[PDB]
Amino acid sequence: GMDYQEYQQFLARINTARDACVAKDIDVDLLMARHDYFGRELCKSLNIEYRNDVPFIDIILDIRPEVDPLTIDAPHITPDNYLYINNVLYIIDYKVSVSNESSVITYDKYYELTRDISDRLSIPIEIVIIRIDPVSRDLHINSDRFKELYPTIVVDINFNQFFDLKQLLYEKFGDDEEFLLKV
Amino acid sequence: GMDYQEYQQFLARINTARDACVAKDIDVDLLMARHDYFGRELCKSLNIEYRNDVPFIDIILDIRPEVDPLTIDAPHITPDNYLYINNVLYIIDYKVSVSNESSVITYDKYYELTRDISDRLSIPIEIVIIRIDPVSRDLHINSDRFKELYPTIVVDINFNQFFDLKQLLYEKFGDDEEFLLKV
Amino acid sequence: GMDYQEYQQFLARINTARDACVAKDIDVDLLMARHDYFGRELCKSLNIEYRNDVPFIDIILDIRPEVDPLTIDAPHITPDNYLYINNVLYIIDYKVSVSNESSVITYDKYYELTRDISDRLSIPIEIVIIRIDPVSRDLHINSDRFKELYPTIVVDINFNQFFDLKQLLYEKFGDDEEFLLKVA
Amino acid sequence: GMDYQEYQQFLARINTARDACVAKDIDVDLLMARHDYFGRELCKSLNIEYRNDVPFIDIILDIRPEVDPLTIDAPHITPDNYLYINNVLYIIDYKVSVSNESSVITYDKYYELTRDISDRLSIPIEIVIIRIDPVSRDLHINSDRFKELYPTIVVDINFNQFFDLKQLLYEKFGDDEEFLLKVA
Amino acid sequence: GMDYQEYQQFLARINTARDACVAKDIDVDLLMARHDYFGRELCKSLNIEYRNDVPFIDIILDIRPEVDPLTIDAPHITPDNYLYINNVLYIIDYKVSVSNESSVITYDKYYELTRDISDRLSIPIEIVIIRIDPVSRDLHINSDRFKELYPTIVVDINFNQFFDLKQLLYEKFGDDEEFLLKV
Amino acid sequence: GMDYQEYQQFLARINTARDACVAKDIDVDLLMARHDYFGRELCKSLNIEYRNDVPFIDIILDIRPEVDPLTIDAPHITPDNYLYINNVLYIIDYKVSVSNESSVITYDKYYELTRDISDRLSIPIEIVIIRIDPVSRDLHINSDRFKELYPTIVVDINFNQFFDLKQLLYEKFGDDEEFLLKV
Amino acid sequence: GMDYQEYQQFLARINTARDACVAKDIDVDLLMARHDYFGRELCKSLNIEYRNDVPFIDIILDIRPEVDPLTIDAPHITPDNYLYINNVLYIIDYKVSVSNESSVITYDKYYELTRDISDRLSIPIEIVIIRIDPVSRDLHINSDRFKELYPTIVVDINFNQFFDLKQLLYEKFGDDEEFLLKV
Amino acid sequence: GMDYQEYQQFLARINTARDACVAKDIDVDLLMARHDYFGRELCKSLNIEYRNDVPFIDIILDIRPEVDPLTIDAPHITPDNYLYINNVLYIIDYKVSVSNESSVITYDKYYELTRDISDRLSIPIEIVIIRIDPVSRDLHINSDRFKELYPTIVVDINFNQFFDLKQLLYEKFGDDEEFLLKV
Ligand SMILES: O=C(O)C(=O)CC(=O)c1ccccc1
Ligand SMILES: O=C(O)C(=O)CC(=O)c1ccccc1
Ligand SMILES: O=C(O)C(=O)CC(=O)c1ccccc1
Ligand SMILES: O=C(O)C(=O)CC(=O)c1ccccc1
Ligand SMILES: O=C(O)C(=O)CC(=O)c1ccccc1
Ligand SMILES: O=C(O)C(=O)CC(=O)c1ccccc1
Ligand SMILES: O=C(O)C(=O)CC(=O)c1ccccc1
Ligand SMILES: O=C(O)C(=O)CC(=O)c1ccccc1
Ligand SMILES: [Mn+2]
Ligand SMILES: [Mn+2]
Ligand SMILES: [Mn+2]
Ligand SMILES: [Mn+2]
Ligand SMILES: [Mn+2]
Ligand SMILES: [Mn+2]
Ligand SMILES: [Mn+2]
Ligand SMILES: [Mn+2]
Ligand SMILES: [Mn+2]
Ligand SMILES: [Mn+2]
Ligand SMILES: [Mn+2]
Ligand SMILES: [Mn+2]
Ligand SMILES: [Mn+2]
Ligand SMILES: [Mn+2]
Ligand SMILES: [Mn+2]
Ligand SMILES: [Mn+2]
């Protein structure tokens, strides 16, 4: 599952935390660690290099190395990862959620901001949101085209440790009104 | 659990659906049915009459029946329920979610919009967001004052049937891009 | 349809117009006259008194004459007409359009702005957009409750005069870019 | 008009639809098919190659093949078609509508977004909105310059299939409030 | 013409001013004094009490003294003046300008903000912008209805002193870039 | 200067703090405690009842008790204090600052939002922002009308403890970027 | 004065007009004709080629003809004219108005939008708004630098014919409410 | 501390001033002169070339002179200063303030607007806000990377003259409401 160091460090933060604002930072850090764990494991299953928040401009420079980085009109986005295969650019973002809400938002943004550069480079740019539902552990991938390339992806993992750390956090701060409504 | 008839109605809808948009509608309707199921069971545990989206003006008329409804300067919000006890008005919203995000949004809006009416009536107005985490089944209530009013509140239920209906929906529409990215 | 004198007024204006801005005001007046024509005929069919743009506050004073208009918290809208029967207030707006866009705008505005006053008065307020598609001439009415009151509505009319005058206007101003791209 | 198989696809969808959201997507697909049908026929009449939604950058690369598409400062629009003759770039958009509203929106956007690139290239860029009113079937074209090139444009078509299918849809969904008040 | 005190005081300010920001304040004060001079002279010709920036609420209380000032929903506008005759409320604003721009803005605002209260009181509210062109000295009045009541208004005045003071200001500060573009 | 028990609490908080977010809350609480200290001392000098954040509606009911709090159209603002003397309502806010910026923002808001209720009650409402510069200890009051009532105000007080507590805080967290740039 | 043919064209338009909107169009067109007449006469006095609304990119190409017009990052403004002298670019707009309002608006926009291009080209860009007051006939130029470049600039003209055309318009439409309040 | 000639000029300005608007300009100029004084002294301590408001584009051309200033996509910002050392670009702004508010606003803006140009040049860009608290004279710098380069910075300076000039100003204009509430 998750790294046993990372686990023990979360446990230490929970145990030493006394203030709602510190607790909320742990809550938020748990969610980002969970997303990143999924990303690393997903990339092992797809057999691709693990990346995080890649500047779009670096993606263009990798796929069309003729491009001049000083001038090219690249959108200001940092997707989790990408794959360029058979002259199709797949732009990948990882998500861990019980809902498709965050996926639709990322999708609409990435799709909209990549149209112009797709037309300039004459390269189709496919936006691929790869989401795992943390309760069912099912994978949901919007892109039919990406799924033809990878028709059977198995990411055999679970989120039980994140669940347990979160329950420990709420065990300790569950009657602090500031924590319960902290952004 | 949920009424057996509500269940079978959802099954028939899922079985007869063929389009992404109908499927997303079912998905949204399962979430509202789940919220309302939690509401009914919560209300039994609080020993209050089950209500849903009560016009604020009707609240005022119940608690101060001499008020002229044509003329009172009052907010236009529709909370799930309320409780008026010892001259304190508790405004209640039910939530089912694994995070606090929707709770903070409703709390901020309800709190901000009831300050003035609270001064005019000379009635303290406490905003009580009652959330159940559908995975852990833990109950989180922001308001210390409400929690002091009650003995330990236990709502011992699960959402397994909603989970199962959702899995059927995804077994049938899980490879439909329009569904996976539908709002 | 519209009476001869109205038709001839439009014919005269179209004949004398030489400028895009004048032509556009004619375009807009024709759509207005079409709407009001439908309204008159619709009301004959429903056997209700014809009205246009009634201030909401007058509606409330008609149905609840004891309300004080100086003090009531009530919305500022002016729907085409209304019907108060069996303690239900139906707020009616007429539309003539091949599309539902204008209906949705009016519906959302009126629905949203009447919720609070519905609660204050304890009178359900039903928003009824009665639209006629002027090509097909089918009537489209959103309100099921209203249609239970009036399940058989026939309005046997036509808009040929309005179509003919608009077609004549766009012909006369067909090489006037300013007119062709002018907004209301 | 549209070919049998297209007509029958719409008939099938309308027949199987039971939900407002499905019905609305049909409404919208019918308007799209009507637009594309006009576009195809219009282009036969003008004797130009039929196109739909051409990226502006491809237009520039067709007319000025030495431009570098990675570096040019150029707008991101996708007009229906274009014509480059006598060193004038005509940017064409097709419209089918009884109103000029949609034309004015497209016109203003394209005009405004193409001024700078017109200056950069030293090529006048003429925005041509070709609209057909589907009731009257008159053609309305804003551009005088374009009309000097094509003073005699005849597109002898009709939209009866589209009207009939829409009328059938609104009949089937005529007591569905959600459909009647649903937006695109 | 303008009061000879007021004149001499403007002249003193011009003569003592050394900074662009003080000068601009004189410019602005000249224009408001000119407007007010016109207002006073206009009111002599119409034979009505001179008023300036009347709270709308005071207007309602004068024409319908039954109204309760604590509750009535009065628009937040302060027109220069008003006349209530034959159950018509004329809301008057003075303008001195070579253009109708400021008139259209005031008209659109006053017209829009007075519709609801017109309907509540059942009193037509006519908005009357009375403008004098300071160069031709012609009077322009939008309201046909107001002009039937006052078919021949003569305001026999001129603005030569304001013109002269302004030219003196520009004589002194005409090469100060800060003054010339000061708001 | 400040209450000794209050000082001790602050010292303890600073000593036990280990996190930027906790430290920033101390920084904020120090600023509000300084504002409130100034307020108490100011109200002693002026011989007025000490208040803090009074809802406008309560001000109205105090000065005009015949008003119906359920119907009156009144602004929703919460100034620090007020003084009603000779049928003039002075609305008071305390400020502690080296700049007039916060004063202007409070002034502009209170002034604008009290014009209508001034008209409705026929009571002049004067906005009085009373600022002490915590370095020079000079008192600055915008309102000449208020200063005619109170021509010599001496609040002979000291903010050295607030300065010292703040310096302790900045010596523990002075190398924490999260703290230095915390909002 | 203005070309005799332009004059007679305006007369015919005024004589054949019957609608408020046509009349306002004439009014707007008289103002633009007046601006452009001032422009032509100003340019003769400055000894520069008459121009109107010059694309900024054409300016850059004239002054730096090696610049690649496809690629230069430049603002999209359309000033009335310009003068490039001793490596200083003077951006010129003509104004006819009795106040500075329209001048401040154009100056702020032109100044803000040319800062970046000025840095990139390494060319100072001075924004020169040249306004004639149509009543006093005085000439006001904001820019000291431009005024230092030139001998005293005299543009000795009047706008009497525009005044007379405007009076004819108002003799015919002065009692038409739609005209008086038309934008 | 500050240049003696500069001091004298300020004293003269304060003595000859009679108007709120002129006084407020002095107040502003005093604050900018204090900021610039701090800047000069700071740059002496750090042994860096004193600069003020450098356009970003000039920074780029200094550090990477092969870039084409006409084509490079670069932010339009004007930080106070910079340091390019070991292929790391430190963007510096000087602040004089008792609060971190202005620092956070400058930081957030510079950070956000330099991310893309960092990617394009492959040069890390660190945002360095250097604030001196004018009361405590303590120096606060957000950037740990910058402080690793410069572990001991002593700017041993004094703002007493600025404080004294400000007090003179507030003793001449302390009873002028227009001044006290001037922006
Ligand atoms: O949620 C995701 O799936 C992300 O990929 C998030 C991400 O990059 C991010 C960016 C800025 C702040 C926090 C998360
Ligand atoms: O999410 C909840 O907890 C609600 O209580 C939702 C609800 O009432 C609602 C109904 C219609 C529109 C928006 C919210
Ligand atoms: O379109 C309709 O159906 C109307 O009923 C329109 C109407 O009353 C109106 C009149 C003037 C301005 C805005 C709307
Ligand atoms: O309406 C038209 O005339 C279009 O040409 C529309 C069109 O291309 C389009 C397609 C998808 C989204 C927005 C516009
Ligand atoms: O221009 C007019 O005609 C006015 O009537 C103006 C007016 O009341 C006013 C209000 C606030 C500030 C300055 C002028
Ligand atoms: O700054 C002041 O002078 C205040 O009087 C502030 C105040 O009331 C307040 C209100 C809400 C939150 C925190 C402070
Ligand atoms: O007023 C001026 O001085 C102009 O120079 C105006 C002008 O060019 C213009 C043209 C079209 C739209 C907006 C302004
Ligand atoms: O406040 C600072 O720290 C500045 O560095 C400010 C600055 O550059 C500036 C820019 C424009 C106008 C006035 C000051
Ligand atoms: Mn990411
Ligand atoms: Mn992600
Ligand atoms: Mn609810
Ligand atoms: Mn709820
Ligand atoms: Mn109407
Ligand atoms: Mn209508
Ligand atoms: Mn298209
Ligand atoms: Mn099209
Ligand atoms: Mn006024
Ligand atoms: Mn006025
Ligand atoms: Mn306060
Ligand atoms: Mn305060
Ligand atoms: Mn121009
Ligand atoms: Mn100009
Ligand atoms: Mn600076
Ligand atoms: Mn600085």
Author numbering:
A (entry chain C), B (entry chain B), E (entry chain C), F (entry chain D), G (entry chain B), H (entry chain D): 0 to 182
C (entry chain A), D (entry chain A): 0 to 183
Lines from the paper:
Bunyaviruses are a large family of segmented RNA viruses which, like influenza virus, use a cap-snatching mechanism for transcription whereby short capped primers derived by endonucleolytic cleavage of host mRNAs are used by the viral RNA-dependent RNA polymerase (L-protein) to transcribe viral mRNAs. Here we structurally and functionally characterize a similar endonuclease in La Crosse orthobunyavirus (LACV) L-protein. We expressed N-terminal fragments of the LACV L-protein and found that residues 1-180 have metal binding and divalent cation dependent nuclease activity analogous to that of influenza virus endonuclease. As expected from the initial sequence analysis, LC183 has exactly the same core, cation-binding fold as found in PA-Nter and more generally in the PD-(D/E)xK nuclease superfamily.
